[PDB]
Amino acid sequence: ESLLIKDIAIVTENEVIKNGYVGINDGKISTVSTERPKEPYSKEIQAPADSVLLPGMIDIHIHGGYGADTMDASFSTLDIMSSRLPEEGTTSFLATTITQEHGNISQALVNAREWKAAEESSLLGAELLGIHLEGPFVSPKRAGAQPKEWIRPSDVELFKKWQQEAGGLIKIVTLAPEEDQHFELIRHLKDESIIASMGHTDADSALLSDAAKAGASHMTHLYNAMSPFHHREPGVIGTALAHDGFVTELIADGIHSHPLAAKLAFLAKGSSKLILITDSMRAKGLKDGVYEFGGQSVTVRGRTALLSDGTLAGSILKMNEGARHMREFTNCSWTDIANITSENAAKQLGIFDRKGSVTVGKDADLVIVSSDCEVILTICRGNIAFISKEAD
Amino acid sequence: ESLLIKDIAIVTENEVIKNGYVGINDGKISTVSTERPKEPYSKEIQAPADSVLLPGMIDIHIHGGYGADTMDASFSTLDIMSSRLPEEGTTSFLATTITQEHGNISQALVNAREWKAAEESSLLGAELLGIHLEGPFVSPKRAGAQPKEWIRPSDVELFKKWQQEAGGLIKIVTLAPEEDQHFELIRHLKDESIIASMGHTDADSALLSDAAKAGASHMTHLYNAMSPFHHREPGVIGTALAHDGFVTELIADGIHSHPLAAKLAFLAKGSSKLILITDSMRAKGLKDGVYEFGGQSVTVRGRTALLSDGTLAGSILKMNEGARHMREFTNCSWTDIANITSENAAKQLGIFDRKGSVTVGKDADLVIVSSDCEVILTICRGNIAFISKEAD
Ligand SMILES: N[C@@H]1[C@@H](O)[C@H](O)[C@@H](COP(=O)(O)O)O[C@@H]1O
Ligand SMILES: N[C@@H]1[C@@H](O)[C@H](O)[C@@H](COP(=O)(O)O)O[C@@H]1O
Ligand SMILES: [Fe+3]
Ligand SMILES: [Fe+3]
């Protein structure tokens, strides 16, 4: 169905239209205007009072949620994340693996390749943009909740095998540069236009600066599983903040880091160099309990997911809720929200021609939210994928 | 002598005049223009080729230099700092005390009061704007090079005595808020328009936020003698960076903190909320050796001043050299330099009506520097106080 969204504040690439209309046809945005379009629309949505139209949010680092985990390596896994992610305003994602035995990683990559290729559920809900390979090529000293017994130095031929198994779907790799001899895998990823994200790394600042020259461009979940900031040895944390060649992922749940630490990331990076993620695992959107994550038991109580030794282990964060917290932490604009939840991700993935802004020609991936970032309605490639309690 | 500076790039409050003239009469700036003034001038200075006219730099945290230390409590002490500070582009300063026996602090404060009052050397060189009382009301856990045996909790009646002894000259106090029961002294300083600078403090973020409400507004030498940044407990370092109610002093020598840490301070604070200082002690501008500082022996080798246990102990930094490093660390503008070396200090001390910008009506405190921040000439309240190797 062609679709028209009526009388809403629209957050475009560069501005906020106070009251506008967006028309959608054959999956794409065909009209963005202050005035009702002439053309007829099959369904029309009358937007609630103080609502805001944002570009659909893009989560580049997310393991699971709603009982599912990428590592499970079934079609059901992705039917579920696909189906349910629109409820937190997410319209596309990178299914994220974890450090694990290489054959477990192979199964997850092949599953995703085949599920996307099936073109069944992969046409509906949040679009599987590909894979974020998180580990195993990380530091034994910054494992966090990555299974320690499966951590191994970078292996370019094994990755090459993984990327063939993935049918080219791997878009980002998280790795520790100091565990990558000669920046071999970093140099390989740069060659292949796969983002090299520095994470779970105990590297010093000098080495990170050299990695950026070899092609590193992202930092994985800023503050988490990183060598700390010392004012005379800034480590991963200080380089991620002060080095303008890195885009920084951030988990804005107010648990992975303090509100002032989230605010510092926004001050230091600016709204064009920061990408909110959930890093969520399978207990997101379920109840208290114990859940598998990377072969370990994670005990979820309240908003905190912990290993038995109290190590934080993924999040329980919904994407829209991250937006709300960042607005509280920094008083940023709706424009900045669109940036740090959608636009920056799209640009970094090289898909800004089709995602990441409310703009004519792009996929009609959109979220209607309240002034408080509650999700009201989500559209995915032109189909309504979620409608909240405010139906009618 | 009335004075005219000819054909120079001038850094005003809000702009850089590419080629201008500044005329000076009876100690004040009387003309700032792109065109040669009509009025006759007794001496005229022809500025060298790529030079820049900056407002004279203001150092709000400096113990000594050139063999002298505030704590020495002689007229010679201030004759020397007064006389010699213009060589690093400094035209006004706060002589800074240290943690020490209360009678040693009394002597330093009375000396300064009497030396300023004498109006002899106090009319020439860098102007003694008053005193920065650094300690003793600091943390035993963040003493750094402050003499540990003299550290004591805040005492409002003893300060009140000190300020009477100082003839009202105390403009800033460095103190640890957690050692100030009920924020009593902080509340007192706010009442008296004396800056309360948080420093040598092991406080957490919550407490610092409450101190700012009680009236705390500065942070003493950002990164040094501070509880570290942890991403979930930001401490003094993270609050100083992310809390917009604090102006942050910074020692830009590339030794007290790493270049990326200096750059982070500039990203997080912006150029209106950061104040370069030297924190220099008596060995500044002398040779390698051992020197007294706060009753301890400081071994100066190269650019590093250390206690016998390797603790950093004041700096050997010249003010203009701090400007040069910050330009290297951040690529900031000449305008930003004027801010972080002069304007912000003046505004914070409540003396922007007379210092801190190249502006008609203000004291003629000015520094001519090269494109690399080498000092060429310094004027103090209208008198030439330093002329380098480029005479003629
Ligand atoms: N998925 C990662 C974990 O692996 C890590 O343990 C956690 C906390 O990291 P940190 O203790 O360094 O802040 O971040 C995320 O939750
Ligand atoms: N005058 C202070 C010292 O008291 C302190 O020891 C030093 C280093 O501080 P830190 O080791 O915390 O960086 O800063 C300045 O030099
Ligand atoms: Fe991780
Ligand atoms: Fe993760």
Ligand SMILES: [Fe+3]
């Ligand atoms: Fe100090």
Ligand SMILES: [Fe+3]
């Ligand atoms: Fe000091």
